[PDB]
Amino acid sequence: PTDPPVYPVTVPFLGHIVQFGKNPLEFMQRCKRDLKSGVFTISIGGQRVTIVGDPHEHSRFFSPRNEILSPREVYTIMTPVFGEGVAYAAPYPRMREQLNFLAEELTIAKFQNFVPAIQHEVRKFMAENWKEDEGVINLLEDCGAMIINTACQCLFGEDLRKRLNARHFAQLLSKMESSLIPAAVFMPWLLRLPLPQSARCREARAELQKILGEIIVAREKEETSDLLGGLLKAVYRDGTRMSLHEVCGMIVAAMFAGQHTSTITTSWSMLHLMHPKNKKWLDKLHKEIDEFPAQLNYDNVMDEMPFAERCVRESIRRDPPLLMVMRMVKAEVKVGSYVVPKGDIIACSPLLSHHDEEAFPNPRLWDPERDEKVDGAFIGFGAGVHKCIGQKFALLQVKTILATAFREYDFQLLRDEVPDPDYHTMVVGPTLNQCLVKYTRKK
Ligand code: HEM
Ligand SMILES: O=C(N[C@H](Cc1c[nH]c2ccccc12)C(=O)Nc1ccncc1)c1ccc(N2CCN(c3ccc(Cl)cc3)CC2)cc1F
Ligand SMILES: [Cl-]
């Protein structure tokens, strides 16, 4: 019957842009509390956004089919990045074919050699950059570098990596990313505003696709199982091969999706583990990794690091890098006693749901041993048909980096407290200038 309650608006043009922009964790909890409803509506620039902040109603967000709750419309800003006809921009069944092919390239079947590849690259990094017996580094920056270097080592064959190294790939991604206006998800008119300098997303994407095209021509001529090689075997149900434009787009989705999420997750994990109050947890991590061989394998990381995975999960739980998952409502959906109407953006919020007192009591405490107290309350990687396809790969990366770094080094935060989350970037992570850390090589 009933519309969800709307948080009062004092300035119509902006709606709640000020309070939601400045501090989304505070503002979302305050609406939930003061309006006395887990499901509620805010305005971003006049656009209604209805938030399903009751974890007992998570499935009313994650379960409806695409023609009812549609991701396409929220993600049209990505069209220049992934490409026209790619991913969200494809008809829904074709989108699903595409994402499923990419998912297959990121399953456990592909991981046999990943751990040595990740480990070797991480050691290379520490050997080049953490040389002395002790030194000061920015941990957020170094994790970033390690994430992209390790992902390329895993996913791209040597011929590719010779035309497109990690630094070159990073720069191309950065140009595609710096073009985006995150808020245009709600206010597409922002696209009309002038830029400080010309965007370079079209250029960067075309340069990538051109390089892949050349790699393929050269491979056709010599004769296979890197990410690219895999995607080139994909054949849709209609009998057509995934095109070079589509393959490029999937590869971009892969690298783009993991570069900040995984970096941030790595960084938070280390930041907690190195803080003095969490000595008991770092001691546990050492119990679990200390009998590992110098050359880790699949079994060590997949099967024998459950504590470290808990540490990683709890870091995403407390400070999820994606605060909101969103859909356009194409037809009304019932959620509890409310009805959410056509034209709303509906959202399920990992930031909010992960701070629900019932599901996660004392939510600002980092407790790797906690379990959700409401089934499905943890939505850091989403849920249902659209759940994260990179999650097993990302965990494999993060856990391998933790096992490798803390084996050879001790770390200490320069400041007194784990960093504040910086809510000012679309992928939210620890405040960059609060992330200075002193490493000390173990004797
Ligand atoms: C810790 C790291 C990561 C986090 C926290 C994260 C989070 C999420 C979330 C919350 C979703 C659901 C989005 C939605 O329902 O609309 C998701 C979907 C997705 N993620 Fe990730 N992700 C991570 C790493 C990765 C990586 C490494 C990839 C690499 C390919 C990736 C690719 C995707 C894809 C393709 C989907 C879309 C699935 C779909 O719409 O069906 N993610 N991720
Ligand atoms: O990080 C974001 N998006 C990118 C887009 C993207 C890359 N690869 C993908 C694969 C599948 C789906 C999406 C993507 C992204 O990296 N997403 C992502 C990463 C890992 N797994 C899944 C997704 C992102 C994150 C937040 C955001 N917002 C939320 C906040 N917002 C907002 C907040 C406050 C105010 Cl006042 C105004 C606007 C505008 C839109 C928009 C975004 F595009
Ligand atoms: Cl395009």
UniProtKB/Swiss-Prot annotation:
EC number: 1.14.14.154
Any one of the GO CC terms: membrane
CDD domains: CYP51-like
Membrane topology field: Single-pass membrane protein
Taxonomy, superkingdom: Eukaryota
InterPro entries: CYP450_sterol_14alpha_dmase, Cyt_P450, Cyt_P450_CS, Cyt_P450_E_grp-IV, Cyt_P450_sf
Family named by the database record: Belongs to the cytochrome P450 family.
PANTHER family, A to Z: 24-HYDROXYCHOLESTEROL 7-ALPHA-HYDROXYLASE, CYTOCHROME P450 FAMILY 7
The name this protein goes by in its record: Sterol 14-alpha demethylase
Originating species: Trypanosoma cruzi (strain CL Brener)
